[PDB]
Design a protein around this ligand. Structure first.
Ligand SMILES: Nc1ncnc2c1ncn2[C@@H]1O[C@H](CSCC[C@H](N)C(=O)O)[C@@H](O)[C@H]1O
Lengths: 15, 483
């Protein structure tokens, strides 16, 4: 169902 | 003192802008940076803005604000649990798949709201803010925290004041991670954060496009550590309103849910412009409401979410492998890999749950171990493409000999990796049993133990597979054929 799943605390690049 | 802090931040910027020192000097560098940061921090007054009430005194305001703006506020209550901290607790029975939480877009803090706030002028000029939405959210949080009548005050006043990200660890708590895969990322996090603090401290105290910021009166290292830790432990990617792109966001009320194993049940509803969460499992009244954060490893949970998750069914470690340019068969192996859509060298994963290696890594190791005649069969003729197609499939080996070779290699490589740790599995277990430790120290020790337990599981699995395929080769059993 989820076209746009939401990941709590999704990992991002900080540099 | 203003001139004194500015000079300490100048030195910190220079130190944390220096190139990588080499893996063997990264611990030394980390301690040096910690020394500078702690000297600055002890000369400052902590968080610039603190609140008079307790954390739980502000949850009624969060609920009223969320309610007035269309969010779900019935069926749960906020409870301070020992293991996870504050979280949501069901006050009625909630059935699996029931839509029980929703949060309209107007409540969110987004990159878009950061731009249109008092941060806007500096955002429009600073190349780093424009490129790094996570850093933009952190300053959005700090600017609204320092603004007496912020729309988001009910959210900011219910956020934690401290986190268990490694930025908060003591030196000796991080020292437990020496010789692991994870510690490099702890070093990077610390250096990145200190560099960013020093850079923006200078920008805010001198640049005119930051003249109107609420942070000019006070912007402490503790402020910045708090802000980036708030974002890293709870930020989310959501679609833009027109659904064409994605953006980062903080999602109030729903982000109070703690993590358990399962599947993602939270999605964005573009048509109605709100985040929606359905119940991951049945929750009876009095049970904590959990969500599944995502398929992250315990390394990622410790470093970026500030917790270690026992029985994480998605835990993994890295293993770097590549075909050597000195291989007489390099050209053929690289061509087979390219046709299979696999690079000639890559960082793969070893998994705790069965199976320990992915289809991609299995395919890589099969090619890595192929003979010249096997390689030719995957390159030439009307069955070559069919042979490529099964390379990731455990049920269809290239040959029994190929399997014995590749599991022998993996057993030996995982065993070698285990020998590069400064403690053993048995020693780590003794530490956890026979020492009394802080939450943070236990996070570090369990993380290094977990890395080794995954390697040890891979050794045992590879040994079972090796013996299975050795017997097939001894019996010269007919190979399976894909039909
Ligand atoms: N299963 C779990 N075990 C321990 N801590 C957890 C957890 N799931 C979530 N957390 C904690 O919750 C944070 C994510 S935000 C979730 C709400 C948070 N407990 C709060 O008091 O505001 C993480 O950074 C971690 O501190």
């Amino acid at each position: 169902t989820l076209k746009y799943p939401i990941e709590h605390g999704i990992v991002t690049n900080w540099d | 003192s203003p001139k004194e802090i500015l000079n300490l931040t100048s030195e910190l910027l220079q130190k944390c802008s220096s190139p990588a020192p080499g893996p063997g000097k990264e611990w030394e560098e980390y301690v040096q940076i910690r020394t500078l940061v702690e000297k600055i921090r002890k000369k400052q007054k902590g968080l610039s803005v603190t609140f008079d009430g307790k954390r739980e005194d502000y949850f009624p305001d969060l609920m009223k604000w969320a309610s007035e703006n269309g969010a779900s506020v019935e069926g749960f209550e906020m409870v301070n649990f020992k293991e996870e901290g504050f979280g949501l607790r069901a006050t009625r029975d909630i059935k699996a798949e029931e839509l029980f939480l929703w949060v309209p877009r107007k409540l969110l803090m987004t990159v878009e709201s950061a731009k249109n706030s008092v941060l806007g002028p500096l955002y429009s000029q600073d190349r780093i803010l424009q490129a790094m939405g996570n850093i933009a959210l952190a300053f959005h949080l700090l600017c609204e925290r320092a603004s007496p009548n912020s729309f988001w005050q009910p959210y900011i006043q219910t956020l934690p004041s401290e986190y268990d990200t490694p930025l908060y660890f003591e030196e000796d708590e991080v020292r437990y991670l020496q010789s692991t895969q994870a510690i490099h990322d702890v070093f990077s996090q610390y250096k990145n954060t200190a560099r960013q603090y020093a850079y923006f401290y200078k920008v805010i105290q001198t640049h005119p496009h930051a003249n109107k910021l609420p942070l000019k009166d006070s912007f402490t290292y503790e402020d910045y550590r708090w802000a980036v830790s708030s974002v890293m432990t709870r930020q989310n990617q959501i679609p833009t309103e027109d659904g064409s792109r994605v953006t980062l966001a903080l999602i109030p009320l729903w982000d109070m849910c703690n993590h358990t194993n399962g599947l993602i049940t939270t999605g964005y509803n573009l048509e109605d412009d709100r985040c929606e969460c359905v119940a991951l499992q049945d929750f009876r009244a009095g049970e904590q409401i959990y969500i599944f954060y995502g398929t992250r490893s315990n390394a990622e949970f410790v470093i970026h979410s500030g917790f270690f998750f026992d029985n994480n069914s998605h835990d993994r470690v890295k293993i770097k492998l590549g075909v050597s340019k000195s291989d007489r068969l390099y050209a053929m192996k690289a061509e087979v890999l390219a046709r299979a859509g696999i690079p000639t060298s890559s960082v793969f994963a070893l998994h705790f749950t069965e199976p320990p290696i992915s289809a991609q890594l299995l395919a890589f190791l099969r090619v890595f171990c192929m003979t010249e005649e096997e390689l030719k069969e995957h390159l030439l003729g009307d069955s070559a493409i069919d042979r490529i197609f099964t390379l990731g499939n455990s049920e269809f080996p290239v040959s029994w000999d190929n399997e014995v070779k590749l599991w022998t290699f993996l057993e030996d490589r995982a065993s070698l990796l285990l020998k590069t740790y400064k403690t053993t599995i048995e020693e780590d277990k003794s530490v956890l049993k026979n020492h009394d430790l802080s939450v943070r120290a236990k996070m570090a020790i369990k993380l290094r133990l977990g890395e080794k337990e995954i390697l040890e599981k891979a050794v045992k699995s590879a040994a079972v597979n090796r013996e299975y395929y050795r017997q097939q080769m001894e019996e010269k059993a007919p190979l399976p054929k894909y039909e």
